[PDB]
Design an enzyme around this catalytic site. Sequence first.
Site, short mmCIF file in Angstrom:
data_model
loop_
_atom_site.label_atom_id
_atom_site.label_comp_id
_atom_site.label_asym_id
_atom_site.label_seq_id
_atom_site.Cartn_x
_atom_site.Cartn_y
_atom_site.Cartn_z
N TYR A 20 0.87 -1.21 -0.24
CA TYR A 20 0.04 -0.11 0.03
C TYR A 20 0.78 1.11 -0.03
O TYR A 20 0.28 2.42 -0.08
CB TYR A 20 -0.86 0.12 1.40
CG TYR A 20 -2.10 -0.56 1.22
CD1 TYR A 20 -2.42 -1.95 0.70
CD2 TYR A 20 -3.39 0.28 1.11
CE1 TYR A 20 -3.57 -2.52 0.61
CE2 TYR A 20 -4.73 -0.32 0.76
CZ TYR A 20 -4.69 -1.60 0.75
OH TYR A 20 -5.79 -2.34 0.40
N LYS A 73 0.23 -14.73 4.39
CA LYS A 73 0.56 -15.83 3.50
C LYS A 73 1.93 -15.90 3.45
O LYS A 73 2.78 -15.83 2.31
CB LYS A 73 0.11 -15.22 2.17
CG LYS A 73 0.27 -16.04 0.93
CD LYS A 73 -0.90 -17.24 0.82
CE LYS A 73 -0.56 -18.26 -0.16
NZ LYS A 73 -1.57 -19.26 -0.21
N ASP A 75 -5.39 -17.59 2.68
CA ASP A 75 -6.59 -18.20 2.06
C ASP A 75 -7.47 -18.92 2.58
O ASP A 75 -8.64 -19.16 2.63
CB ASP A 75 -5.71 -18.89 0.58
CG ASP A 75 -4.60 -20.00 0.95
OD1 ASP A 75 -4.54 -20.72 -0.05
OD2 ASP A 75 -4.36 -20.08 1.97
N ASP A 93 -7.52 -5.58 4.31
CA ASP A 93 -8.43 -4.99 3.53
C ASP A 93 -9.48 -5.80 2.97
O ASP A 93 -10.66 -5.68 2.75
CB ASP A 93 -7.59 -4.20 2.19
CG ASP A 93 -8.71 -3.74 1.07
OD1 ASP A 93 -9.78 -3.46 1.42
OD2 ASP A 93 -8.43 -3.86 0.03
N1 LIG Z 1 -1.47 -26.99 -4.17
C1 LIG Z 1 -1.14 -27.40 -2.97
O1 LIG Z 1 -0.58 -28.42 -3.03
C2 LIG Z 1 -1.61 -26.63 -1.64
C3 LIG Z 1 -2.59 -25.64 -1.54
C4 LIG Z 1 -2.71 -25.10 -0.37
C5 LIG Z 1 -1.92 -25.56 0.60
N2 LIG Z 1 -1.02 -26.18 0.35
C6 LIG Z 1 0.19 -26.33 1.61
O2 LIG Z 1 -0.50 -27.04 2.69
C7 LIG Z 1 -0.22 -26.82 3.86
C8 LIG Z 1 -1.26 -26.52 4.89
O3 LIG Z 1 -1.96 -25.29 4.67
P1 LIG Z 1 -3.12 -24.95 5.57
O4 LIG Z 1 -3.16 -25.60 6.63
O5 LIG Z 1 -3.31 -23.25 5.60
O6 LIG Z 1 -4.30 -25.52 4.42
P2 LIG Z 1 -4.96 -26.60 4.10
O7 LIG Z 1 -5.61 -26.54 2.77
O8 LIG Z 1 -3.86 -27.87 3.88
O9 LIG Z 1 -5.92 -27.08 5.28
C9 LIG Z 1 -6.88 -25.85 5.58
C10 LIG Z 1 -8.18 -26.53 6.51
O10 LIG Z 1 -9.09 -27.12 5.35
C11 LIG Z 1 -9.15 -28.41 5.60
N3 LIG Z 1 -9.13 -29.29 4.35
C12 LIG Z 1 -8.17 -29.03 3.72
N4 LIG Z 1 -8.58 -30.18 2.42
C13 LIG Z 1 -9.41 -30.97 3.08
C14 LIG Z 1 -10.00 -31.96 2.74
N5 LIG Z 1 -9.59 -32.46 1.24
N6 LIG Z 1 -10.76 -32.71 3.37
C15 LIG Z 1 -11.29 -32.13 4.59
N7 LIG Z 1 -10.75 -31.17 4.99
C16 LIG Z 1 -9.82 -30.53 4.40
C17 LIG Z 1 -8.22 -28.92 6.64
O11 LIG Z 1 -8.68 -29.71 7.64
C18 LIG Z 1 -7.74 -27.56 7.64
O12 LIG Z 1 -8.76 -27.64 8.58
C19 LIG Z 1 0.94 -25.54 3.64
O13 LIG Z 1 2.16 -25.99 3.81
C20 LIG Z 1 0.57 -25.18 2.15
O14 LIG Z 1 1.61 -24.57 1.53
C21 LIG Z 1 -0.68 -26.69 -0.75
#
Ligand SMILES: NC(=O)c1ccc[n+]([C@@H]2O[C@H](COP(=O)([O-])OP(=O)(O)OC[C@H]3O[C@@H](n4cnc5c(N)ncnc54)[C@H](O)[C@@H]3O)[C@@H](O)[C@H]2O)c1
Lengths: 427, 427
Positions: A158, A228, A294, A318
Site C-alpha cells: 500500500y 500468506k 487463503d 482490506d
Molecule cells: N496446491 C497445493 O499443494 C497446496 C494448496 C494449499 C496449501 N498447501 C500447503 O498445505 C499446507 C497446509 O496449509 P493450510 O493448513 O493453510 O491449508 P490446508 O488446505 O492444508 O487445510 C486448511 C483447512 O482445510 C481443511 N481441508 C483441506 N483439505 C481438506 C480435505 N480435502 N478434506 C477435509 N478437510 C480439508 C483442513 O482440515 C484444514 O482445516 C501448507 O504447507 C501449504 O503450503 C498446498
Amino acid sequence: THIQKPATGSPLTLLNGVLQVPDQPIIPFIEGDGIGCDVTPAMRSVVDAAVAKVYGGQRQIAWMELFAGQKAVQLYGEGQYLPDETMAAIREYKVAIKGPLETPVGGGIRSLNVAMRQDLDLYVCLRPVRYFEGTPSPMRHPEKVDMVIFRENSEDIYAGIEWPAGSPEAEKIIRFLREEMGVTKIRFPDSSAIGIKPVSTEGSERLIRRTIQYALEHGKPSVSLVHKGNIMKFTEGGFRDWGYALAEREFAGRVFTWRQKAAISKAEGKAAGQKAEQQAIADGKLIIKDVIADNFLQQILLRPEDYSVVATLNLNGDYVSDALAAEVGGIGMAPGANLSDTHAIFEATHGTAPDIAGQGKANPSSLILSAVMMLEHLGWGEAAQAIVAAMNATIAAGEVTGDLAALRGDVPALSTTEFTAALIRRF
Amino acid sequence: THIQKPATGSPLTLLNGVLQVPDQPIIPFIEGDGIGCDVTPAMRSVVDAAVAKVYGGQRQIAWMELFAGQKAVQLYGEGQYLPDETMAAIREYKVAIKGPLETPVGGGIRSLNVAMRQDLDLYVCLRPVRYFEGTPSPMRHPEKVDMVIFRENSEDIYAGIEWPAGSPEAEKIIRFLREEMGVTKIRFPDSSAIGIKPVSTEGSERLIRRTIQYALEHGKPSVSLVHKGNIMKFTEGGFRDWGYALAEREFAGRVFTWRQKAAISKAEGKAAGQKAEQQAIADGKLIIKDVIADNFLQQILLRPEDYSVVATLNLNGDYVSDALAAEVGGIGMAPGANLSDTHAIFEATHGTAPDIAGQGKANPSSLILSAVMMLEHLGWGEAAQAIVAAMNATIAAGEVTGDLAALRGDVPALSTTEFTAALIRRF
Ligand SMILES: NC(=O)c1ccc[n+]([C@@H]2O[C@H](COP(=O)([O-])OP(=O)(O)OC[C@H]3O[C@@H](n4cnc5c(N)ncnc54)[C@H](O)[C@@H]3O)[C@@H](O)[C@H]2O)c1
Ligand SMILES: NC(=O)c1ccc[n+]([C@@H]2O[C@H](COP(=O)([O-])OP(=O)(O)OC[C@H]3O[C@@H](n4cnc5c(N)ncnc54)[C@H](O)[C@@H]3O)[C@@H](O)[C@H]2O)c1
C-alpha cells in the site's frame, strides 16, 4: 483559508498522557465523495440526537468541516485534492471523521485515504465486525460473527511504490534486480510493471503489540495472525514470526501460542501439545494462533465462531474486512478507525458507491457506527451506547436501507433519510 | 532413478497439434504430502472404477508414480524435494495429477507447487466452483454459486522474489530504491523485508485471452476482471486495462466491455450506457466487466449469481478460490487444473491438511473432480460424466465426509474409504 473554526467549540488536547475532552469539542469532519453526501449528514444528525438525549445539552459536538476530494478541488482549485490546511487541522484537533474518498484505477492520484493514514502515521486500522440482530444476511448463522480486525495501516504494498510497464523507471529497477540482485524469477521482464512490498519488524511489532494489548484488556479469547507466509516468507512470514516472538517476550506467561504448542509437540507429541493448549484456555490465558490467509477466508465462512481478534497486514486486512462485513450485511454495516498513538480518523470500510451515488439510498450505519467508535474514543460512552441500542432496535424491527433489503424478499427498503428518521425516533 | 514406465501403457501423443490418447494412456501421478495419502488412492480407485464401467474394459489408465515432497526425500535423499526426473517425466507424458505438497512458512523451501507451475509454464490455474445439490453449506443459497476462476499462474508476488529484514540484500535494494529510484514511502527502512511484484502485459494478456476464449466457447454470460488497481495501479490496474484492450482488439463483435460502456456513458449519459449494455446482452454478447478485489469478495457472498467467469491475478486468485469454495462446502469440494498450451497438471485447491492427516478423514472430492477435469482433457467424456453423476447422487443422498458433516447437524461423517466406496457403488 476556506475552513472556519466553530464559535463555541474548544479543541481536544493531550496532557501528560490523557486526551482532554471539552464538553463542546471541536470535531473536524470531511463529507466524502459520492455517497459521502448522504452518509455524513445522516451520521451528524444521529450523533447530535443521541448526544442531546443522553446529556441534556451539557455536551454538544462542535462540528467543523474540512475538505478533501472533489469538494476540495471545487473550493481550492485543480489538483487540490488534499489541501495542507486539512491535514494541519486534523493534526491540531486530534480526531476527525470522514466519508469515503474516490481513488482512480490504473492511473490518477494516489489514494487520499491512504495518504492521510501515512501522513498522520495512523498505523492501526481498527474494524470491529459484529452482527446486529435481525440484519438480512447471506449466511445461515451470521450471529456467529463477532470479531475485531487490527489491520496494519502504514506499510505493505500500500506504500504505493511501483512503476509502469515499459517505462524507463521499470526498466531501471528490472535491470538492477537482474544484474545486481541476481533475480531470475521475473517471467516477462520486457513488459513487467514492478511493485515493491515493504514489511518491517518495527511496523509489524507495533501493530501486533496493540492487538494483543486490546485482546487482553477486553478479555478476548484469541488473537489470530493471518498471513500468506509460505509464499511471501520474509514479509508475511516475518509478520507471523515477529508476532509470535513479541507475544512471548512482552507478554510471557500471559499468553499461550501455537509456536509454543509446536515446541511442546515436537518434543513430547501432539497429545502433550494439545493438553498444554487446553490448560491455557482453562487458565483464561489469551491464545495466539495463526492462519494462512487463503484458508483464513475459508474458516471465517465455515466457522467464524472460532475467531475473535485478528492481527494482519495492510492488504490482507482490506480483503478480510470485506469478506467478514458481507457475512453481517455488507460494508454498509462496517465501521472503522485509523489510529496512531495520539490521533484518530474515524471512517467507514466502504467506498463512494458510484452505483447509488446521488440517489439517497446509501446505508449510513457504517459511518454512524464509526461515530460510535469516535464517541467511545472521546469518553462519551453513554451517547455511544444509546446509538448502539437504537441501531439494535431499528434493524431488529426490520427497518433497513436498500443494501440490506436486497438480501431478502421479505424486507422492504427505506431511503437513507427514512432510515435516519427510524433510528432517531427511537432515542 | 526411482521411477518406472508402466509395462502396458503408451504415452500420449499428438497428431496435427492435437492430443492423441491411447486406450491405455500412461498418466503420471504424485501422491502428495499429508492427506495426499488419503485422497490420491481414493481418486485412482474412483477413476479406475468409472473407466472400467463406461468403456467395458477396452480402456484403462496406466498410472505412473512420480515423486515430490516428503516421499521424494525419503526415496531420493535429503534435499531432493523435487527430483529433476519428476519434471522431465511430466514434460514427456504431458498430463499428470498430483496431491497436495507442503510449503513451510517463514523460511524453508520455496513452494514446490509454484515451482512445478513455473517450470512447465502452466500459466492458467483453472478452478471451477459449483454447488452439488444437498451439500452442507454455511450459506443460505449456495446454489447461486456457479463460477469458473482463471487465476494467473506464472507471475505476481508469487515469483518468490524477496529478501529478509536486516539482510545485506535487503539493505542493498532499499538503498537503491531510496537513493537511485527516489522512493520515500518506505515507512521503516532500517527493518523492512522487501518483496517484488512483477505483473506484465504479456503475462496478463495470455491469461485473459484464455479466459475469454473459455467463456465464449462455454456460452458464459460474463468475464469479471478482478484487481486492486486503485492502489496497485500499474500491476493490478495494468491487468485490468490490458484486459479490456485485448478483449476489444481480439474479440470485437463478440464482447461488450465496461470500458466501452464508460465511453457511451460519458458522451451520452448513463442511461445510454445502461441501454447499450442491455442490448449487448440481448444480442448474445459476452460482457467484460471489472471489480475491485475487496468489493469482489463482498459481492461473491452477497450476490454470486451475478458472476460467471473470473479472470484475476495470482494472489487474488488464491484468495478468491478459498472464499468461493467455502460457499459450496469448503476446499474439499474444489477441483483445479494447472495448464499451459500443451501440458496439464491436475490438482485440488486444498493443501496437506495437517489437522486431519493420518486419520483417514479427508474429503477426496476435490482431487476426484480434478480427475474429472483430467478425463475431459483426455476426451474421455463418458467416464468424466459418470463420476459427476455418482458424485451428485452420493452427496444428494447425504453420504459425505467429516468436513461437510460438520457444517450441518444430524449428518453423519463417512471416512475417506467409506465415501470412496459410496461413490463407486453408483457405477
Ligand atoms: N496446491 C497445493 O499443494 C497446496 C494448496 C494449499 C496449501 N498447501 C500447503 O498445505 C499446507 C497446509 O496449509 P493450510 O493448513 O493453510 O491449508 P490446508 O488446505 O492444508 O487445510 C486448511 C483447512 O482445510 C481443511 N481441508 C483441506 N483439505 C481438506 C480435505 N480435502 N478434506 C477435509 N478437510 C480439508 C483442513 O482440515 C484444514 O482445516 C501448507 O504447507 C501449504 O503450503 C498446498
Ligand atoms: N475509505 C474509503 O474512502 C474507501 C474505501 C473503499 C473504497 N473507496 C473508493 O470507492 C470507489 C468505489 O470503489 P468500489 O465501487 O469498489 O467500492 P464501494 O465500497 O464504493 O461500493 C461497492 C459496492 O458496495 C455498495 N456499498 C458501499 N457502501 C454502501 C453503503 N454505505 N450503503 C449501501 N451500499 C453500499 C455499493 O453500492 C457498491 O455496489 C473507489 O474509487 C475506491 O477507491 C474508498
